[PDB]
């Protein structure tokens, strides 16, 4: 059985956020939707996917630039952090994401942050702790 009606709504925020923040996932999906900003995601992290694909029904994982509610970019477990960054160079869109090559691909916060300066596109970053926005910003300042 099927029926799909919901409160669709129009975001109109002229503004945009920069730097790292201490958001999580739903906060991010809101701002992403709001601004139509681009969201790099890794299908590897099924925990993230089990939220997205449920918030944006009927989707059944894809690869590539996933226009599905939010503008996503689905890059593999197998693509290195420098390679996905090189790809994102062509797009050069304002992003909002978590520190990409931090945990799915086995890094540390430092190694993540360094690699992320090599991204030549704007990117709001979200760490799952406030006390780490400081640390992460610190790497972005110090390397």
Assigned domain for 81 exists? yes
**CA max distance for the chain:** 56
Q: What phi, psi does 36 have (nearest 5°)?
A: 50, 30
The answer to whether the CB of 41 falls within 8 A of the CB of 73 is: yes
106/38 Cα distance (integer angstroms): 23
Q: What phi, psi does 52 have (nearest 5°)?
A: -55, -60
41/79 Cα distance (integer angstroms): 12
77: containing domain? 9-143
The answer to whether the CB of 138 falls within 8 A of the CB of 132 is: no
Assigned domain for 4 exists? no
55/21 Cα distance (integer angstroms): 23
Assigned domain for 126 exists? yes
- Residue 16: CB atoms within 10 A of its CB come to 13
108/104 Cα distance (integer angstroms): 10
* Cα R_g (the chain), whole angstroms: 15
Count of domains for the chain: 1
Residues in the chain: 143
**CATH label of the domain that carries residue 105:** 3.40.220.20
98/21 Cα distance (integer angstroms): 9
Task: Provide the CB-side half-sphere exposure for 116 (13 A, CA).
Answer: 28
The alpha carbon of residue 35 and the mean position of all alpha carbons in its chain are separated, in whole angstroms, by 13
Assigned domain for 3 exists? no
Task: Give the method used.
Answer: NMR
**Secondary element (H or E) of residue 89:** helix 81-91
């Amino acid at each position: 059985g099927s029926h799909m009606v919901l409160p669709s709504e129009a975001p109109n925020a002229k503004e945009e956020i920069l730097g790292t923040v201490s958001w999580n996932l739903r906060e991010m999906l809101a701002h992403a939707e709001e601004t139509r900003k681009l969201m790099p995601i890794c299908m590897d992290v099924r925990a993230i996917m089990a939220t997205i694909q449920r918030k944006y029904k009927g989707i059944k994982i894809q690869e590539g630039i996933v226009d599905y509610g939010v503008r996503f970019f689905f890059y593999t477990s197998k693509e290195p952090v420098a390679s996905i960054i090189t790809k994102l160079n062509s797009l050069n869109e304002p992003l909002v994401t978590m520190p990409i090559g931090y945990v799915t691909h086995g890094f540390n916060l430092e190694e993540a942050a360094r690699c992320m300066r090599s991204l030549k596109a704007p990117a709001v970053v979200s760490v799952s702790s406030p006390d780490a926005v400081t640390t992460y910003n610190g790497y972005l300042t110090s390397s």
